[PDB]
Assembly symmetry: T
Homo-oligomer: 157 residues x 12
């Protein structure tokens, strides 16, 4: 009666490209987070070691969320190492052992870079699909929380 006949959302390829930008930075952040997690040394090692894993957990869940949102709307994600390295906007993480103080500053900057990407694409994403912007909001919130939890170590008052 209100039933429709069988003959049954299309996202633009630009929209997919915007999600792809978010994806590579989330993957890069997870990879750098693990690097820091392994190679951080010095005062308050353990807290940083543990917090960095929490960050990585969130970034990995986030990248799965974004990639699978792309798939739901029939976009095609690319999370391959070469693509991530070639297209990420995050500054490269330095090699070797790094002091806890250095790691705090480095990782804060890299989180902030990842968040910036999401904030940069937000309005274009929101205009086409507010339901995707919903996921972006959760990511921004969770990442900016991680930034606060990590950077607070270096704050002098």
């Amino acid at each position: 009666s209100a039933r429709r006949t069988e003959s049954i959302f299309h996202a633009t390829p630009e929209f997919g490209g915007n999600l792809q930008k978010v994806l590579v930075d989330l993957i890069e952040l997870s990879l750098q987070g693990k690097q820091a997690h392994w190679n951080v040394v010095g005062s308050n090692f353990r807290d940083l070691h543990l917090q960095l894993d929490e960050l990585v957990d969130f970034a990995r869940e986030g990248s799965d969320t974004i990639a699978e949102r792309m798939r739901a709307l029939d976009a095609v994600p690319d999370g391959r190492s070469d693509t991530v390295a070639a297209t990420t906007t995050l500054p490269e993480f330095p090699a070797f052992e790094r002091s806890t103080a250095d790691v705090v500053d480095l990782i804060t900057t890299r989180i902030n870079a990842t968040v910036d990407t999401i904030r940069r694409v937000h309005d274009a994403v929101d205009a086409e699909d507010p339901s995707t912007a919903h996921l972006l909001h959760g990511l921004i919130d969770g990442l900016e929380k991680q930034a606060w939890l990590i950077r607070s170590e270096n704050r002098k008052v």
Copy 2:
């Protein structure tokens, strides 16, 4: 002191139109749940088990969604109708066919019916968002969850 002095402070009340838009979402979510179980029981053929299991996950989400929408209506002083006669008379989903259906047919059928459910939510979205962005927040989660289900189900039939 910054304390308010009213003895009675009323809550947010939904307009009749708003209540109607959520009612439209509700009946389609319930219908999708009923069709989801029908497919879950009656799917046969290649890759039976995966579809059987995925369809239950879809049903779980749709049932949680219908409860969320109906209870959101109650929170905003609107009154849901999820009775079988109403669902049958007012759902926009194409009817699920009778009897056993092949895995390939079930994939196509259920994908279409999820698409129909999501379309209802997307149709009322802007009007809902305009009156109450907090309800739109719930609609966003529903759209995301359902379109995820659509991908997880439909991909069975997608070739190369």
Copy 3:
């Protein structure tokens, strides 16, 4: 030695029809239970709200059990909205908000109707397949428990 050769239970279509009768009433009960769960208001709202969800949980598990028992014996269930509405024996649940006292009486009657269907088909089911009657017994027990738990609210002694 005691091994049989490869060349290997058939239920009647009437038996399937009997399970179908149980199925539609279980689904209808779940749908009405949710309606009541949302729309119940008044004294002792919370207990009814919560108990009605427990009833719905049991009825949903029950309808899955029956439908899948049908499938196991190669019967074909029909739990579609139109079929449920057109064939259920349960009295229609009234529209709008209902008082807790009214809901107690209404839902008790609808549980009792569902149980009656199972009791009506029991002997025919038991005669053909005692293993199915086993499931019927569990349902009757669980539903009649729910009836007691709900109706006790209105009992005056």
Copy 4:
């Protein structure tokens, strides 16, 4: 290589708006516990239990808001004096209160809390939609609590 060679900061007004939500969430939590302990009469147990769920949500909410402030370089103040001095919630009364009275009282004070979030919503959303996302969850959860509590007093 697309790699860049980086400080979002809340405006004072934005921080002030979240501070307003915070004190009402904390006050609601304190009032919820007061009601939880002191409610008496017909259907005591349901109210007792539901009020604790309200408090659980409101406490999670206040932590969420305060930590969002921290994330955006704002500084929360959830101290007792500040809460008492700046909360917009009508004062919850002392002593034993009937279930009927508690239902009415708590519904009003939840509604007051939601009103604050609804008042600041548009300004918060204009500056930071990600924070408004949190406000939506709070509005939804609290208005649900209001429905679950107030339905007890509904006549027909």
Copy 5:
């Protein structure tokens, strides 16, 4: 260097102490049995809350009776929780037969919880004088049961 070179016997309860814990035990078991009776036979306004709270009371009283009985065993005393002994020696007013209204059950159970607590409070000082470690267990029981009493009786309180 400081090692003892003794068999080292454990602390043994006096007959008075044993008797005092036996008194607590029978009232805890009686309360459990009456709690179930009420759990099953309560009817009327707010049935579900009372039905559920009565089971929590029974859970606590059963754990309590086990705790006391095993405390007796630990101190070389012998519990008797048999039906005849409980019926013959409990201080609790008899629970009435048949279906009982929620209002009636609230009043009845509150009274029986209070009777159980009274028994524990009556023996407390004598128990505490001999073995403060056992008084520790009595404190937990008094606290838990008086909590149950408040949670139940508040239903009937009219303000």
Copy 6:
């Protein structure tokens, strides 16, 4: 539309039969705890632990039966005086009892409890097969407990 425009009630005899099962289940539970506390000697711990599992099953069983009575408009009586006055179980002795004695005693009293359920089974099944379903679960569980306990005393 097949929609109808509705009161199963147990006969007094049926209710009486379930009452018989109930008092024996409760008595078994009380005796099980008595044994649980007072058993001593070789293999104490196993018996101590197994007896608690017996009590757990018997308590769940008594609740199941009493609530089945309620479901069918019957009224249980599980009070101490009634249990002592109407139970068919041989009295469990007071004081410390050896593991060997406890095994024999408890097996007898489980068997007595099962015998009651087996005695009323056919009459219960004739009126309500759904209740007999519950009796079967009880018979199975209790006879399992009897086997797990009595095997301790088996000679070869």
Copy 7:
């Protein structure tokens, strides 16, 4: 007082015939468990994973069932024999073939062997029910659980 006065009250004792009927059920449940694992390891081809996983669920149920039946025998003073030689010499199930088997073949093979196991339980049912309805209660659960497994497995091969 209504207390009985016997010092020794014996339990229910199964007849030799009853003990034999449960023994028949036992060996087929164990054989099904062994064949279930064989198929679980050696299934290859289209939809491998679903069958691999479902076969373990079947094995879990059959193992729980064999324990239930053997322990029911013990409860009724009967003595089970679940040794490999006895199972091999007295099972009624057709032999599972050797080596790797295709998903389609495994579906057909295992369905047949579940059907065989259920047939044994249905064959002894009435004789078991006549002596002890409480044991028949267990048989009912076994039949229901196993026929559910049969449906969940066989549906892979059912076309349209």
Copy 8:
């Protein structure tokens, strides 16, 4: 045979007893509020450990305040945990505003925990004299809070 034939009233707290538990309650609630303030606003060396430990302290103080308040209710006393009352009657030194260093927070919170414990220790003997079962709850609180104090203050200890 031994069954009582009375309504049997429960144990009722004296006004002094009620007042004493109210004193404990407001300090527990104040400590909770200050604990969250510190949880949010702590910055500097070893932030995370302090952030996390402060939440554990708050968890314990919240459970504690609920326990005390419900103990009051069980004994027919009436708690007041409202913001105005807590602010007006707490004995805790005010927590300062704004971001505070980890070193500062350690010292500040240790002092406020100690103040809370002091209140409990001050009322203890009077509570114990009337109701040892309540003193039982006070012992758990003193133990838990003094543990929290050790776990926090050890950060600033220089050996």
Copy 9:
């Protein structure tokens, strides 16, 4: 750059045969363990009953581990009743009820037989694939623990 081209461990059939020897003895042990679990009677029945189930749990997990290791290396396990009975090295478990003392000695011997098979094939397995020997070590350790836990019942000191 270090990437290999697409055109990509092969175990000998003798290696597979060695794992097969372990498999049949693990399955036989599980079957005998259940037999003992059901039919053990007498002093300390309960401990033996419970410990025998723990043994069976370990042996069942072990046989799955070995069979699936065979599959991973493209060997083909045979755990069928006839094959197990015809090829197991374990002494037959006796029929009927057995005393706890007898069961202790019997099961200890059968565990020791199963362990002996693993120890006999160890060096040949280790030489070809140390990663498989890794699994053998876990099994030997777990089984010899079970042997100690069971046999200690009969130890007189």
Copy 10:
């Protein structure tokens, strides 16, 4: 209004109090070590029950030793749980070497549990006089250990 304006110091244990808890600590640690020794080396009739019960005893004694040691820290006292100190200062009779029969182990461990409890009972009143909150923890330990003693010793009881 009622806020204090002080640094507020915590409760500090006297040297006698510290010494008394140290005595409890070494006996709890010794009991744990002997419990494991027995856990590993027990053989004979009813091995499994004893093997398993001995681990439960060790679990309780380890939690107990941690509780006491951290209670010392909370009150500004310093524990010493090192091997040499425990060996040199424990009051427990030495556990014998090699495999021991279940009957022997029951008697041996019962004696060593009783020795541990005796230490706690000996210091109790002095601890209770200074700090009833610590006596609260001692009551839990006495209760738990005497329960373990009953559960173990009952194996050897012949009636």
Copy 11:
């Protein structure tokens, strides 16, 4: 007394060669994890769901493995490099192709890449075992877990 008297006792230090061998294992495990997720998102076609799910299990194991190896390096005073540029420049795995891939293609592709990862571990095994058998213990678990994944994935494509 048998107590040692040194104030400082150093831990086991890995040779540069040993550190390099574990680094080789690390980059291939990370690369496998990245490719595993790519396949997990982009697989389409017959039996989509099973592969989708199994690929996540593979990713979970590989991620746990990379962490284990990197942390083992840290324990032995070696310094891991799991950065994207390094992984891309030094992994031995063939590149995963772009875009959506069929279930059959993904099975073949991923099996090959697991085989490649395992080959790296087997190549460095003997040199690792020679210096530190405790690290070889970890390599054994990795090889076993990964070859299990290979079987569970590849069996989809194996015919009769």
Copy 12:
């Protein structure tokens, strides 16, 4: 039928080697708890918590080794006197110790414990590779603990 018609026993040297590992594992556990209680200063909480994880691993390890000895007909001695008299670990000091000192002290004593396992490894592996399997897990876990603890004191 391939059915056989059966006593692995450790040599005294093998048993002695496992005894050496056992006493160092127990001593490490006791020292870990001492450090857990008495550590003070900057980053107290992390050290406090990490030391308990070390103790957890070392206790599981000592039980594993002692029970492996039992499995192979050897007899462990984990008594206090024996541990104090035969452990190779440098004595842990009494009294409060700074986090920096505890890091250095505990790292040394973990390294001492690992050294013992590494010293006996080859002899153990030659006789019983299945026991060496357990030693590998212990070496891996303890050296991980050493890294997690010592990293606190690392300069750059």
